Structures are given as C-alpha cells and as structure tokens.
C-alpha cells in the first residue's frame, strides 16, 4: 500500500506537469506513446 501510494503521488505530479505543458489537441489526436513514454522514463529515472 505505501509503495502504491507513493507511485500514485509521483505519477500524478509528473502527469499533471506534462499535461499542463500540452493542450487538448496534442494529447487527444496524436499521443503515439509520446507523453506516456516520457512519463514512464521520467519515473524510472531522476528526470525533471
């Protein structure tokens, strides 16, 4: 549970930042594993 909560918090913050960087059209039309890959490899490393 503690690890799940920490994962929730970190991923939510990273996703909030990323989705604030972009608009609705870029996140709706063509994701193509770009925002998601950025979130994933930012979670697996210390990227900010």
């Amino acid at each position: 549970s503690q690890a799940e909560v920490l994962l929730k918090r970190k991923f939510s913050d990273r996703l909030r930042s990323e989705i604030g960087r972009l608009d609705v059209k870029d996140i709706v039309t063509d994701s193509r594993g770009r925002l998601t890959l950025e979130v994933r490899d930012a979670l697996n490393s210390g990227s900010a």
Binding site: S1, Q2, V5, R9
Partner: protein, 52 residues
C-alpha cells in the same frame, strides 16, 4: 501546493501528540464554492455557452 502544505502542517501538528499514527498521504478532492454562489458560477458558465 495546497496538498503539499496541508500534509506538512498536518504532520507537524500530529508530531507533538506522539500518537502511533503515521501519515500515509493527503490528497485534494474538491474546492467547490458554497451553495449560495453555485447558482452564480454555473450561470456564468451558461452565459459563456450562450455567447456562442
């Protein structure tokens, strides 16, 4: 910012009591306005739609 500061304040407040509880997490849910101005706010939304 509200969640972070709330968590910091809550853990600082809990610490002196020295209870066994450990603060796992605090998360924001909603910041709605009071009911008396809910009509004003959703009327503003309706007016924004009514322009188009």
């Amino acid at each position: 910012v509200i969640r972070s500061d709330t968590q910091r304040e809550l853990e600082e407040t809990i610490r002196p009591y020295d209870m066994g509880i450990t603060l796992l997490d605090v998360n924001f849910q909603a910041a709605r306005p009071p009911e008396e101005v809910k009509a004003a706010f959703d009327d503003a939304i309706a007016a924004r739609e009514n322009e188009q």
